[PDB]
Design a protein around this ligand. Structure first.
Ligand code: MG
Length: 208
RNA sequence: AGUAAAUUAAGAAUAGAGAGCUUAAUUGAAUUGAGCAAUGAAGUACGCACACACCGCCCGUCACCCUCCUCAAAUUAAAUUAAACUU
């Protein structure tokens, strides 16, 4: 890295800086005073104070990008969100007043609740004990649990789709199916959890 | 980490000749542990009949030639003795 270890990650929260001084906890108040005598990293090209920037969706975009084609990957995510909004508007208009209440037309809220439905609480680590490969039930961190949900989505759509279907049409159809706990990405989570019960007694081999 | 990946340009050398090489630029990620059971290294302790240094040293059965010794059925071979007393 070209940043020395003494550099601090930038804080790009607009409201945080403009809060009244008394509203800030003394711990936060102390850090701000310390940061005045430190070096701050430059903000990333994609780090902005925009009110429409969601870290979860921005991360999902980077996991789809191939060869640094951010314009294409962002376009694919923009087309997906729109394909989900247009799919719920059609259902909402073609539904009764009672049914209309339940229907969710926010694509950003369908994406977050979809991913969370696919996240697995426990995973598996492959281990070779006595020249035999065993996978031991592991408890997954918040970072490993989130990564696996996004990875499983980007892999079901990339591979298990018809040749002429497009990613905005497969991903939209999968975010909505996961949003209802019916999709194949949810089935992957159910299989992972079910296998952990099979290897329930083999967690002892853990050394880490 | 401006890394990987992807995409460009130029240069060396040639008369010409690389999908090779050198260099410059662009776009631009994911991830980094509740680590040491193992693998390797380092440190400490201990062991060593190894020092060619464990790809070490090393012990028995088995296999030819040669040296010495022992036992043993028998056979024969030479060797080796000592006196006893009568009249
Ligand atoms: Mg040439």
């Amino acid at each position: 890295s070209r940043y020395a270890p003494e550099f601090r990650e930038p804080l790009i929260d607009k409201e945080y800086y403009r809060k009244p001084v008394a509203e800030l906890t003394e711990e936060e108040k102390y850090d701000q005073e310390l940061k005045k005598t430190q070096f701050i990293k430059a903000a990333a090209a994609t780090e902005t104070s925009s009110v429409f920037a969601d870290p979860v969706i921005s991360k999902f975009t980077n996991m789809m990008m191939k060869g640094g084609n951010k314009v294409l990957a962002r376009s694919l995510m923009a087309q997906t969100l729109e394909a989900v909004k247009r799919k719920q508007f059609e259902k909402y208009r073609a539904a009764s007043a009672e049914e209309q209440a339940t229907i969710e037309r926010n694509p950003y809220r369908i994406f977050h609740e979809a991913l969370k439905n696919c996240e697995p609480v426990i995973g598996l680590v492959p281990i070779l004990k006595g020249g035999h490969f065993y996978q031991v039930p592991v408890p997954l961190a918040d970072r490993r649990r989130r990564f696996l949900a996004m990875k499983w989505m980007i892999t079901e759509c990339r591979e298990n789709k018809p040749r002429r279907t497009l990613m905005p049409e497969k991903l939209s159809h999968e975010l909505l199916e996961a949003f209802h706990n019916r999709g194949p990405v949810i089935k992957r989570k159910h299989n992972m959890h079910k296998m952990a019960e099979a290897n329930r007694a083999l967690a002892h081999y853990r050394w880490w």
